[PDB]
Design a protein around this ligand. Sequence first.
Ligand SMILES: Nc1ncnc2c1ncn2[C@@H]1O[C@H](COP(=O)(O)OP(=O)(O)OP(=O)(O)O)[C@@H](O)[C@H]1O
Ligand SMILES: Nc1ncnc2c1ncn2[C@@H]1O[C@H](COP(=O)(O)OP(=O)(O)O)[C@@H](O)[C@H]1O
Ligand SMILES: Nc1ncnc2c1ncn2[C@@H]1O[C@H](COP(=O)(O)OP(=O)(O)O)[C@@H](O)[C@H]1O
Ligand SMILES: [Mg+2]
Ligand SMILES: [Mg+2]
Lengths: 173, 512, 73, 460, 460
Amino acid sequence: EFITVARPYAKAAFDFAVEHQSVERWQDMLAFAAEVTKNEQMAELLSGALAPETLAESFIAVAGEQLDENGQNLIRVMAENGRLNALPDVLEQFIHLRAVSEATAEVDVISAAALSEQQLAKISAAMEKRLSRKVKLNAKIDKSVMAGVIIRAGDMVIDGSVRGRLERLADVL
Amino acid sequence: QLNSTEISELIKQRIAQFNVVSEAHNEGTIVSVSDGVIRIHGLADAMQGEMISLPGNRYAIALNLERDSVGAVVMGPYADLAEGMKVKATGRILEVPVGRGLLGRVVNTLGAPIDGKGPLDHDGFSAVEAIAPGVIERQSVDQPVQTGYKAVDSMIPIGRGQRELIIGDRQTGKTALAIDAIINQRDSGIKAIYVAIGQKASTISNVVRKLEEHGALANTIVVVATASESAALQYLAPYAGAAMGEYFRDRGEDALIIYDDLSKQAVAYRQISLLLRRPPGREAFPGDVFYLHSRLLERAARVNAEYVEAFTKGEVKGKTGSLTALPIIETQAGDVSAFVPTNVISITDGQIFLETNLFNAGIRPAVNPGISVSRVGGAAQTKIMKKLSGGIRTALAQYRELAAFSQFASDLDDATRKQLDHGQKVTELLKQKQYAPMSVAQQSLVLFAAERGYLADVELSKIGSFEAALLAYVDRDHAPLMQEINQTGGYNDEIEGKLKGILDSFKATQSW
Amino acid sequence: SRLLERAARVNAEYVEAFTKGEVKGKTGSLTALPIIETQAGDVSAFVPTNVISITDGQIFLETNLFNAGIRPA
Amino acid sequence: MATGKIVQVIGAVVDVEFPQDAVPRVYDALEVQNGNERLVLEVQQQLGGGIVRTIAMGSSDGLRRGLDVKDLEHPIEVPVGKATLGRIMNVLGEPVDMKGEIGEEERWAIHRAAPSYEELSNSQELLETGIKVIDLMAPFAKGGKVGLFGGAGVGKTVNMMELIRNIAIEHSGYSVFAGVGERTREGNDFYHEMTDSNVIDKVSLVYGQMNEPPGNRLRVALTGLTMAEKFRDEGRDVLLFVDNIYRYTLAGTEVSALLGRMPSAVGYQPTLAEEMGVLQERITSTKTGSITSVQAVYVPADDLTDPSPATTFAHLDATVVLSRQIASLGIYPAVDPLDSTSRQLDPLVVGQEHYDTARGVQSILQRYQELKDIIAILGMDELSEEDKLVVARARKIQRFLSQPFFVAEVFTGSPGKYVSLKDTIRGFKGIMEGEYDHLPEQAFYMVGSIEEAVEKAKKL
Amino acid sequence: MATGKIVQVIGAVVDVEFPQDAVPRVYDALEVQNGNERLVLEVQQQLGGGIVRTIAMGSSDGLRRGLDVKDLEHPIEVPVGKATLGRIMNVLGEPVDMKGEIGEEERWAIHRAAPSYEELSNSQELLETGIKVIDLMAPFAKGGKVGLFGGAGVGKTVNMMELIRNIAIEHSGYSVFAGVGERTREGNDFYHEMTDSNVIDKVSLVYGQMNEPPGNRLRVALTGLTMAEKFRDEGRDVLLFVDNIYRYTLAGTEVSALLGRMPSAVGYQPTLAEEMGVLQERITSTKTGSITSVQAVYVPADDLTDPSPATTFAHLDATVVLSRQIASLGIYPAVDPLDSTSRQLDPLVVGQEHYDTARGVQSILQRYQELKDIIAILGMDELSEEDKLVVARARKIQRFLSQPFFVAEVFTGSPGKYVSLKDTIRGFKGIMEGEYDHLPEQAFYMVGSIEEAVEKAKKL
Ligand SMILES: Nc1ncnc2c1ncn2[C@@H]1O[C@H](COP(=O)(O)OP(=O)(O)OP(=O)(O)O)[C@@H](O)[C@H]1O
Ligand SMILES: Nc1ncnc2c1ncn2[C@@H]1O[C@H](COP(=O)(O)OP(=O)(O)O)[C@@H](O)[C@H]1O
Ligand SMILES: Nc1ncnc2c1ncn2[C@@H]1O[C@H](COP(=O)(O)OP(=O)(O)O)[C@@H](O)[C@H]1O
Ligand SMILES: [Mg+2]
Ligand SMILES: [Mg+2]
């Protein structure tokens, strides 16, 4: 795992994208590179001890949909350091940074069944009061909850599932 | 998975345009600062050993040219520096100001004056790091360097172009013997240099004014790197002192240099090496350390006249130059079976070992025979001193070992009452007070009067008054010969008769 | 250990099975005499400790005896 | 306005991240709100990318990541001057006594360079301490370092209190006492014994004891020293007591290990001889004033070759050894005159008469040391007629070394005496060269000048 | 032409990047224009990306990264054969005296395989040296290896100069001397001794003295050994003197960490024993020619168990161990006879009388060693009247082992003595059986045969 190596590159890419008003394009560009990083043949090439320069050129070629500023520079700098396998994380970090500056939170909700869209809108407005961000709910239908909902807002979690209450009662006994 | 000093805004600069080399190769930026070691980014033009100029007026020495950054050490107070400071590469390999005009000045290891007397009248600059003259450019050391001391000049003779280790425990007269040699060298044309390494400033100030009192300071350069100062200054200081001595050497003159503790230079270099994370060896010293002292001390050399001609472009035709080094080493608890003492014993020519037991017992200077040697030997001496002093150090080697073994009584008294009274009489005669240098004439007549028996019977003691009378009686009346024998060093049966006539006249007339 | 534990005496049934007949009654043997060098007679070193732990016995040859003339020491 | 963020916390080491341009310098002090209490961090290294690695001058527990850190633009600063006399402070210059507040007019940073070469005093001078044994056998250079090697019970504390008293009353200086890495019990009882002797008004105390995080035990000595330096600039002669410099070395070793640097000769930090010299080089005489220092020294495993003693002895000018045998004899101060040493016993430095007087006393005592052993097995009457006299003079020299202290009256009642150097030279010349043979040995015991010895013999 | 670029410079080691289709092999030479000079690099490793790690055969200062380097496609090669006899050469085979170019017809790569096993030859032909202890205790044969072990200042070089004088002048074949990391002063004094003795026409000289950077010291032993191998293959018999082999391994230790290899037992490179054996195994006699060799082997800190001495001991045939204790006595040659040995000290090779004399000398010197601790505590009087006789004889033996040397004729005034094997066994056999029990110990110090000791006894 290489969160720690991806942090500098993500921060540099984002801090550059706001100097040139193209965060939205950079995100899709990094997502394209992160997908090319996963291929079975390309992952065999990245493991191979080619010279950083020719390995970078062998990586530029498979992605022409890329700015001069973005691909031909970021990919080369990451190749000189041998960091290209970090791209899937440089993406996620980038997204996160964006969500930070845009004052947004990707709250996740989990339930045994669909919510009434009044429950869910109340959840949105209430989390937006609990936090200080525009929330973006996404639901999951997990049956083991059976009733109630889990609201996860990053490291904070609120558990109202009947299974959670049952197992807590199990440990009050 | 670890980072390698690539950081957000440098990556952003590379993002702006990959070929940032379109910017100047002449400069860079500090990236980190830790314990006097510095990491710099940029400086594509930097070359190893180069002086890098920092904001303010400070320099760093480029030690490492790595894939993307330069590792350097700061020659001064480093705490004032911070990330992002712009830094410029002077295209100069580490160089110190040098010249005859430095004589009588006290200067930092960079040749910045430290007395209050203003700027330097230096001749030019010379590289601090250099490779000593090759095997074919040397010449045999065959000229004396007389010291003040009767013991060393008789037992452990030093010649112009020799290297003499002065090794001993703390507070045994290592500095006293070296500065008293510097004092004796004035009025003999050989220059001197004193390099204080890791010394406390009160002591350096004391010896500087003590050299000024005796008139020696006008003859000598003093290089000071006190105990408070950055380790890069301490280990670089002896190479600057050698770079100053080497100028006189290459101009066909004579110079003498004292490195006032190589054993602190080694510790400063160990600090610099362990801060750079290099694997240490025995006693945690780096593997380099022998190369550290060797490349420094082999520079002290005597060169033939063809080398002086080829160097000075013909200007000095037909004179031979030399640099005479006397490094000091301090050893814990008197053992020489230690890594750094044995390293320097392996490099230097001779060895003066000063012993703590003798020093406490009042035998000063405490030159321990048997362990101390001169690998140049008699060729350094004036032939009078050579012929008179013969083999006495080996005689004392056995006299010491036998008086140590035969402790119960003076049994088997064949001649041991003569031998051991002679060895006591000689050890008592070699004792000498500091700052009282004896000319070669005075040493020669005293050692003549001692060595071939003429006073082995009279264990009167009272010896110091007998000598102080003898040298006055010959100075005032008996010997115009003093001016002659101090000039020629000649040994002749005619002069032996002249001197033995004086010896019998004094020994008959004066009851000590 | 996996080198030295290969020196073994082997019973007649192992020999008779290994050779698929053609030998009977006889026992096989391999005897190993490893040699180790110690620095100034210290046994507390690493490799001397391991090999002294593995083997069935030790013949200690000492320089103080060898110098005195007791040979083999 | 706070600008940094805590990014790591590992033991006492805290990493904080700043904007790329606002990075603090090396020895700057930051601070954090650790709950309600504020906490001070001293920077130690600048890492890449705005990260800065610091050591906490306090308890590290309770620190979150992401806490706001405020960058003070200067190093640790402490109060200085007269205002600090009689107080007790910690490293940060905060009163740990409870007498309220320090009304200092000025504050000084604890980090600075030693005096320049042209600034040192172009002279060498002695410090008349007023104690016979020290003034005779181990004189003090004004601006020198002195080691104390005795154990416990030997009266070390009373020696320090007598020095604190004499440097103030007879001279006109002050004193600073820096207790680094020592028991809290001893500092408490030392404070009580100094206030019960009216010397507390003349000494300023700083404490970092064993119960303190490493950074406090590291920087307390520099706090004490920078107060002594403020006294120096005023033109005075100052005494600085370091209650155990070996613990300063050992706390530097602990901090070095925490920062992750490679271990040096015996596990000590690689920067040992620098960290020691950076302290000991500020204790010098200057052509405005002077700081003399008395440092209690501890030798690990009784090894004078260990890197810590070996580095400390390079700096010491004098060495006073305290022995329990001399105390069992009821002789105070219990200074051992045979092992006590000073490099100022140089006949050119102190004069021929003083030098030869000290050498004679020492020779007499080390002859008596063997005659005592002969007596112990053969009886008194085996000694020749000459030895019986050197014994009679040795037993008198050995007692003229004792002295009454102004601070020891609570034990002996005697008014206490300050003896000038030339007067003890006279007295020991007398006793040594057979004069004053005609009075009993008890006439010398616990007395001042030798005229008081003859008058006591009269009364006796 | 120039096809590669520098990408790193760490002290003595340099990293160079090449196209992946042209990367050099693992011992090729490379060339760089360092300022105005020409610097040769020897490649030690192939890293992955067309990069290559090399050691600089010269001063590394002044090297920028990004310089162009030129790929010489052959290893380092040195002149060899008759042409190289009366001359001094660099590690690169370049002439270092001021004479013209070398007139060689052939050049050899300095990295070569050792001779095969069926090609070796072994000889029993005892070679006589003037030195009583060396041939009595550790006699060595023609075509064997001699090694001199000692700390610093014990006599290694003076003894090697005596061996050169006593064998190498009254010897027919050519000779090779390699100075590996020793003093240039001694190399100049040797070269002028040879040239003023008109024997220089037979002695090829190579120097890589202790002022040179690590690469020259590392390779210079291999380039000297190549010249010895060439003279061996011509069918001649050759003398090879190596003035400190330890420096070869030390230069490897200095380089080893920079090449990225994990340190071993006491710091040494992991490859210490292979680096040493690859050199040592090819200095051997074969069926076409023989090399007789004397190596000085410095032992650091006098520690005979340091890995480098310990791993060197296995290679040699005769090992002479010098010791500082005996030299402190002044008994030169300071051979320890209880540690020196030879392969040739067998009764079938040497003969029974020699073998018995040498074993008796060892036996009584060992018995004296066993007595020394009880002599130190109790004193000699307690010994048996048998024990005192073996002590007196062992001490007389220790004196008679000393000998004056024609080369030590400038450290002492005594004339040098040459002692034949017959006279030394005749004297040691005489001493052991007590026929000289009446002479004093000083009669044996620094004499030749025993008939000089009987004369010296008369003059006391
Ligand atoms: N020949 C002598 N006779 C009398 N006193 C001497 C003699 N030589 C030196 N001394 C004195 O002994 C003391 C020790 O000498 P010095 O301080 O030079 O020793 P050192 O080994 O240089 O000290 P350090 O190791 O601490 O640098 C000094 O006071 C010096 O004056
Ligand atoms: N100058 C002196 N006069 C009389 N008694 C003394 C003197 N110095 C020390 N003592 C005695 O020695 C004792 C030692 O105790 P203390 O000073 O507490 O030892 P430490 O300070 O080493 O712990 C004192 O309490 C006192 O009884
Ligand atoms: N036979 C001898 N006579 C006198 N001195 C000797 C003798 N052998 C060795 N020495 C002393 O040994 C010292 C160093 O010898 P050297 O060969 O240079 O030692 P190494 O080379 O082992 O360091 C010289 O000063 C020399 O005087
Ligand atoms: Mg000194
Ligand atoms: Mg040698």
